[PDB]
Amino acid sequence: TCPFYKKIPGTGFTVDAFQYGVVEGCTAYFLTHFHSDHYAGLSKHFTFPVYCSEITGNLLKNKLHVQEQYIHPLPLDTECIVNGVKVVLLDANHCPGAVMILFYLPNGTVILHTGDFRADPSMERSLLADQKVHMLYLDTTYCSPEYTFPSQQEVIRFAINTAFEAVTLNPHALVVCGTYSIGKEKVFLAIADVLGSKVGMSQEKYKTLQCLNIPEINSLITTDMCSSLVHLLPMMQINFKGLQSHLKKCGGKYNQILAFRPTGWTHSNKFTRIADVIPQTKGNISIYGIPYSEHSSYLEMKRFVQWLKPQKIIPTVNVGTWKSRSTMEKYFREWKLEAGY
């Protein structure tokens, strides 16, 4: 059944709750972003109102074939009324189209649902600064102190410098980047830019990217693989067998592959820095795992919460085990005792 952490008290609203059939008492279904564990269940046969960002709306229309009459896009940073309740969509610094939602309940309670987010100090100067938030529905993906990772900027600097050096030493090397969802487009776009190439990809992935309102996108991507030396492939194909196979497909235009796997966290983060990352190599193929995260590190998450000072925190990730739930509640109490709220 729909879990309690997907329901907004005092409204008939749910958030990211499309896989339970008709939820008894739901008048509006919000969708924070276009990731499959969040949209799971949506299709052309859905006949209830969906509220979301413009970009998420483009993906629902073009990729899932949801009918236009049920898609309700809202602009960001704007007070809107939905079924008698004031709401605001805020940028979540996750993937394109991703939002946090502020609900202003008729009784005076204010609720923030973060969706999936990567907490940033810039959020401390949005509309959130303007009033008190009583309850917080929090992305707790990485809520443990072992989870450190570098800035997105640092990681893109490393990837750009690595690719540029490799291709300048060998003009017949191909760069491949893995993907299985929207998000992390900066990785392949930044590399293609330094090399003076467009990025080449399947027709399905090009269609997905043309939904995202990225400026000058027609100048940056293409379905012609031959004219491009940055290829995108399914994450599944980013291994030696898949990459050897792919190189055969290119008709001897290339003799070397340098590949990137933008992972979340991996336990080499606890020891190693970004400057010291090394690839796995077999033959003329090298594969780099780079820690490009679109979720809060532990310290980023802690700072945001200690700034916001909520009265109650509801986790939305890692909620399925008693050990995980108990651990998270310990951190929340530490944070509150240290900061004094």
Ligand code: NI
């Ligand atoms: Ni997500």
